Ligand binder design. Structure first.
Ligand SMILES: *C(=O)[C@H](C[C@@H]1CCNC1=O)NC(=O)[C@H](CC(C)C)NC(=O)[C@@H](NC(=O)C(F)(F)F)C(C)(C)C
Ligand SMILES: *C(=O)[C@H](C[C@@H]1CCNC1=O)NC(=O)[C@H](CC(C)C)NC(=O)[C@@H](NC(=O)C(F)(F)F)C(C)(C)C
Lengths: 305, 305
C-alpha cells in the first residue's frame, strides 16, 4: 500500500535525448530513427525572440548550421524542415535506441511524465497533468526546451508534449510532437497569459477512490446524489462538469471498492461545501487532481512496462 | 521556474533489474557485473515467513533452485551466498548494462529515488526520504521486494535501499545493499511498529528557500533568532534539532537568496506558532520536508547526469 506521485520509468526516453545547437542557442532534441525533433526557436537569437519570423530565419540556415550531438558523438545533419513549431532534422544515423513509439495529442485532464533535460542530458523526471487551460505545472529553466512528456503502454512510448516556454505564473506551455501548441499560445516573447484554470473533477474522484483502497475512509458519508445536482455544486467551486463518460471511466475503481460513483460524488460534494477541517486525505491537506483513473489503477495494481 | 518533486532518471537502474524466482516466490533482483542482489526471503514459502530460519532454509537450496531471468533470457546461477538480509547470486554472465555504481548507506533525512518494479519490470519512479524513524513513505505491493532506491552523481549510481516490507501505517522498511536494515526492523512477519517520526527541519528550511527562489515570499518576516531559541520551538512541534552542520549545508541557498539561515529560522518559527492561515507555499498547504538542500540546488540550477 501507500500512494505516491509516480512517473514512468524514463530509460526508453533517455536513449533519445540529444543536444541541438544553432549559432549561440542550445536546447534539447528528440532523436527517433534518423530524425531529430526540437523546438523551432533554436534558430533565434535573443533579439529574434521578441517577434521572430521563423520561415525567414530558417531560409537563411543550411544543414551544416545545425550542430546535433548525442553525448560526445556529433550527428551529421542531412536535411531539415519545419512542421508548425518544431524542427525536423534528418540525420545520417538512425538512433539504435529508438523505442517503439507513437505521437499523441493528449486531452485536458490527462497525465504524463516529463523528462527534464539540459544540454541533451537528463536532470529529473516528474508526473504532470495537462490542465484545463492547456498549461502544465512543471519545473523548467533556461535550456530545458525540447524536453518531452510521455506515457508508456506495454513497450510503446506515446510522446505527447515538447517544452517551449514559461507563462507569467510559473506555468508552462508547449506543443505536441507535430509542433502544434496546446492552448492559444505562440512561441514568441510577448505578453501572454493562461486562462483561468479549473479543477479536474474526474481525477479528484479517482484519487478519493485511491484513498479508500489505502484505508483512508473518513470522508465517506451515507448519502448519494444525482449527476445534475453534483455538477451544480462543482460549478460554484471551479470544478469541471462530470460527464457520463467520466462516470463510465471510474467504473473499474467503483467496482473494486463497491462505492457507486454518485455516492463518491456525494462525499466529494460535502468536502467542497464543508472543507477538510484540518484533516488530510492520503497525506494531503488539499484535494488532488493530477491522478487519472488509469494512474490509480496502474499504481494500485502494479502495472509494469 | 516552478518546483516539483523530481526523481532521478531511472534508465541506468532499469538496465539492472531482473526477476528472481525460488520455488513459488518471485521478486526483483539487482544485476551488477556477474552478481544478482535480492532480498533473502525469496527462499521462503508463506508459512516460512512467520518465523524463518534463513541459514537453514538456504542450506537446503542449491544454485539451480534459483531461476533468474533478465527479460526473456534466463541467467544461469553458478554460486550463492547470504550477506545479512540479502542474497548474492553469482551468475555466469556479467550485465553489460552495469553502470558505474557504489553501495551507500544513507542518513536519516536524505532523499533518493525508488524504481518500483514487479517481476523484474519497472512500474514507476518516485522520490523518497529516509525518515528519522528509518522508514520511507513509498508505494509498494506484493512482489515489489527487491526494488531499489538510488541517487546519481554525474555518471555514478549510488544504491542505498532495497525494499523488504511494509509496516502497519502503510510505511515501508528495507536494507542497504549490504543487507543491513535501516532501523530496528527484521524480515519476519511478526508485529512490528515504526517509532514516532519527526519532521526533518533542515529540509523544510531548504524548501522555504526554494519558495523564495520561485517568488513565493509572503512568509518572510522581519525577525531573526538564535539557534538555541529556534530549537526550543522546533522541539515542541516535533521537528529535529537544527545543528551548525545543517546551517553550514544551507549556506549555498542562503548566499544565493541573501537570507541568513537564522532569519529563515525566524520565519519558520512563526509558521509553526501561527499556522499558514489558509495560504500555500509552492502550492502546498503543509510544510514539506522531503527536499534536501542539494535537491533544491539541483532542481533550481538544472544539474544533469
Ligand atoms: C526554452 O529552453 C525556454 C524555457 C523557459 C525558460 C524559463 N523557463 C522555461 O520554461 N523557453 C523560452 O525561453 C521561450 C522562448 C520563446 C521563443 C518561446 N520564452 C519564454 O518562455 C518567455 N515567456 C514569454 O515571453 C511568455 F510566456 F510569453 F510570457 C520567458 C519570459 C523567457 C519566460
Ligand atoms: C515483498 O515483495 C513484500 C513487500 C510488501 C507487500 C505489501 N507491501 C509491501 O511493501 N514484503 C513482504 O511481504 C514481507 C515479507 C517478510 C518475510 C519480510 N512481509 C511484510 O511486509 C508484512 N509485514 C509485516 O509482517 C510487518 F511489517 F512486520 F508488520 C506484511 C504484513 C505482508 C505487510
Amino acid at each position: 500500500s501507500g500512494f505516491r506521485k509516480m512517473a514512468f520509468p524514463s530509460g526508453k526516453v533517455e536513449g533519445c535525448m540529444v543536444q541541438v545547437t544553432c549559432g549561440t542557442t542550445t536546447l534539447n532534441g528528440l532523436w527517433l530513427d534518423d530524425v531529430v525533433y526540437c523546438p523551432r526557436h533554436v534558430i533565434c537569437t535573443s533579439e529574434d525572440m521578441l517577434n521572430p519570423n521563423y520561415e525567414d530565419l530558417l531560409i537563411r540556415k543550411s544543414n551544416h548550421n545545425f550542430l546535433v550531438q548525442a553525448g560526445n558523438v556529433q550527428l551529421r545533419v542531412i536535411g531539415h524542415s519545419m512542421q508548425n513549431c518544431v524542427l525536423k532534422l534528418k540525420v545520417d544515423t538512425a538512433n539504435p535506441k529508438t523505442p517503439k513509439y507513437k505521437f499523441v495529442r493528449i486531452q485536458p485532464g490527462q497525465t504524463f511524465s516529463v523528462l527534464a533535460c539540459y544540454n541533451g542530458s537528463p536532470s529529473g523526471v516528474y508526473q504532470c497533468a495537462m490542465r484545463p487551460n492547456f498549461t502544465i505545472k512543471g519545473s523548467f529553466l533556461n535550456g530545458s526546451c525540447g524536453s518531452v512528456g510521455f506515457n508508456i503502454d506495454y513497450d510503446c512510448v506515446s510522446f505527447c508534449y515538447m517544452h517551449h516556454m514559461e507563462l507569467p505564473t510559473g506555468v508552462h506551455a508547449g506543443t505536441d510532437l507535430e509542433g502544434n501548441f496546446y492552448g492559444p499560445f505562440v512561441d514568441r516573447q510577448t505578453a501572454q497569459a493562461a486562462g483561468t484554470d479549473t479543477t479536474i473533477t474526474v481525477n479528484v474522484l479517482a484519487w478519493l477512490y485511491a484513498a479508500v483502497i489505502n484505508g483512508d475512509r473518513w470522508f465517506l458519508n451515507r448519502f448519494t446524489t444525482t449527476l445534475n445536482d453534483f455538477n451544480l455544486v462543482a460549478m460554484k467551486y471551479n470544478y469541471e462538469p462530470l460527464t457520463q463518460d467520466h462516470v463510465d471511466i471510474l467504473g473499474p475503481l467503483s467496482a473494486q471498492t463497491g462505492i457507486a460513483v454518485l455516492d463518491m460524488c456525494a462525499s466529494l460534494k460535502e468536502l467542497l461545501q464543508n472543507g477538510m477541517n484540518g484533516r488530510t486525505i492520503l497525506g494531503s491537506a488539499l484535494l488532488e487532481d493530477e491522478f487519472t483513473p488509469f494512474d490509480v489503477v496502474r499504481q494500485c495494481s502494479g502495472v509494469t512496462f
